[PDB]
């Protein structure tokens, strides 16, 4: 009662009563500035009249998947059929795919030899190049290709990588002034696969 307890069971039991004796949840009313967490940008909406229709965007994805369905179906045959730079030789790759010789298109006999890490690596290199040079159809092809060779489920870093790529595409889209501009079809397409196909639908061009 008033005598200390002598065995833990008693102590444990004694405490418990005390606990119930306590309000389970409390809330102290108080009387009266915080760091910022920077967040990367979304994509840049397309200038009016340049945004693709969904049906197009859906049709493309559905098409893209098939392409990856075949590329993967015939990886081994192509695997065994132009010194392919080292994995970490950015410049070498850059020169390789793009040129100043002229560039080495992305054939199924070259990409298929490409391991996952490398695919990722190259995109990076190509992206980096992209930020600092003009988009060319040669780029589109390569980028499209490698995207073709990326295997889900993607590593988080890969995800970020392709996202930065999309964001840059949108940015370059702004500079354009005629629909006849060549870049537009490609840039839209790129911002369609990574937005629809690779599940980053926050970057997508939901029209109107």
């Amino acid at each position: 009662p008033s005598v200390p307890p002598r065995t833990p069971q008693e102590y444990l039991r004694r405490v418990q009563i005390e606990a119930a004796q306590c309000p389970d949840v409390v809330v102290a009313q108080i009387d009266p500035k915080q760091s910022v967490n920077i967040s990367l940008s979304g994509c840049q909406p397309a200038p009016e009249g340049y945004s693709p229709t969904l049906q197009w965007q859906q049709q493309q994805v559905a098409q893209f998947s098939t392409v990856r369905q075949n590329v993967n179906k015939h990886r081994s045959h192509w695997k065994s059929q132009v010194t392919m730079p080292k994995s970490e030789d950015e410049e070498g790759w850059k020169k390789f795919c793009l040129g100043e010789q002229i560039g080495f298109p992305p054939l199924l006999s070259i990409v298929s030899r490409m391991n996952q890490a490398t695919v990722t690596s190259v995109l990076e290199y190509l992206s980096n190049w992209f930020g600092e040079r003009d988009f060319t159809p040669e780029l589109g092809r390569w980028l499209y290709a490698l995207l073709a060779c990326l295997e889900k489920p993607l590593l988080p870093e890969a995800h970020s990588l392709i996202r930065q790529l999309a964001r840059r595409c949108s940015e370059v889209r702004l500079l354009v002034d005629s629909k006849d501009d060549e870049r537009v079809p490609a840039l839209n397409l790129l911002i369609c696969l990574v937005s629809r196909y690779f599940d980053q639908r926050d970057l997508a061009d939901e029209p109107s």
């Binding site: 197009w56 493309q60 075949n70 589109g140 092809r141 073709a148 537009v184 079809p185 839209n188 397409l189």
Partner: peptide, 18 residues
């Protein structure tokens, strides 16, 4: 079709009408 990717791409880019 050792260039079926390059082709596929062009096909896509050309598949854009608007």
């Amino acid at each position: 079709d050792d260039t079926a990717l390059i082709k596929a791409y062009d096909k896509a880019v050309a598949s854009f009408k608007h």
